[PDB]
Design a protein around this ligand. Structure first.
Ligand SMILES: *CC(=O)[C@H](CCCCN)NS(=O)(=O)c1ccc(C)cc1
Length: 212
């Protein structure tokens, strides 16, 4: 369980993206999750469509609300297309999955990490990236243009992102905003403080598919 875990230089995460004026934190977080695992075994890095997840997942409320843990489940159940055969537009619409044709990616299950346990988060993040939530409605996290976020912030979780590494002290997160935020679309939050919930409630509820 290395002292350092970066999947970027591991060839697991692709360039950064933006959800835009679409409240669709959840579908993006997912595509990265599934994505990671998909490349971890096969040795093939891919960019899947979040747009599809939006238009297809009726359980989620597309362009403004969702469950990073429906998306995944969805995929495993059905599947998910490339981000070319289903590029992101930013507006929820009619499911094209079927109309689009044969799927391209399809997992083999979804599991959740025991909330409120850093030790647990890491491990999984060590075996493969994960979808995690937190407080973004933040007025500080909103302004982050590079650094180690300690706060201030709260325990009112409401935005989903992704963890793509950690250090002895900083946890790495991929944001669904442009590369005109944090440190090039990236933000480092601090771990090991005692805060069980985890600063910004980053330890509330996390997840991930399964792959054979
Ligand atoms: C996570 C997400 O999509 C939310 C909106 C949820 C709304 C539920 N009522 N917004 S966001 O945090 O991604 C966001 C998007 C655009 C901007 C300018 C700020 C934040």
């Amino acid at each position: 369980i290395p002292e350092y875990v970066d999947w970027r230089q591991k060839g697991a995460v692709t360039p950064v993206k933006n959800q835009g004026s679409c409240g669709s934190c959840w579908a993006f977080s997912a595509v990265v999750t599934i994505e990671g695992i998909i490349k971890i075994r096969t040795g093939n890095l891919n960019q899947y469509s979040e747009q599809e997840l939006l238009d297809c997942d009726r359980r989620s409320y597309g362009c403004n609300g969702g469950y990073p843990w429906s998306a995944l489940q969805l995929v495993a159940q059905y599947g998910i297309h490339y981000r070319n055969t289903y590029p992101y537009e930013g507006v929820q619409r009619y499911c094209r999955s079927r109309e689009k044709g044969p799927y391209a990616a399809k997992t083999d299950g979804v599991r959740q990490v025991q909330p409120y346990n850093q030790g647990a988060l890491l491990y999984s993040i060590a075996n493969q990236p994960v979808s995690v939530v937190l407080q973004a409605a933040g007025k500080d996290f909103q302004l982050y243009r590079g650094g180690i976020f300690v706060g201030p912030c709260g325990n009112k979780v409401d935005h989903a992102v992704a963890a793509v590494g950690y250090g002895p002290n900083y946890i790495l997160i991929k944001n669904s905003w442009g590369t005109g935020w944090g440190e090039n679309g990236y933000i480092r939050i601090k771990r090991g403080t005692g805060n069980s919930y985890g600063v910004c409630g980053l330890y509330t509820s996390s997840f991930y598919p399964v792959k054979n």
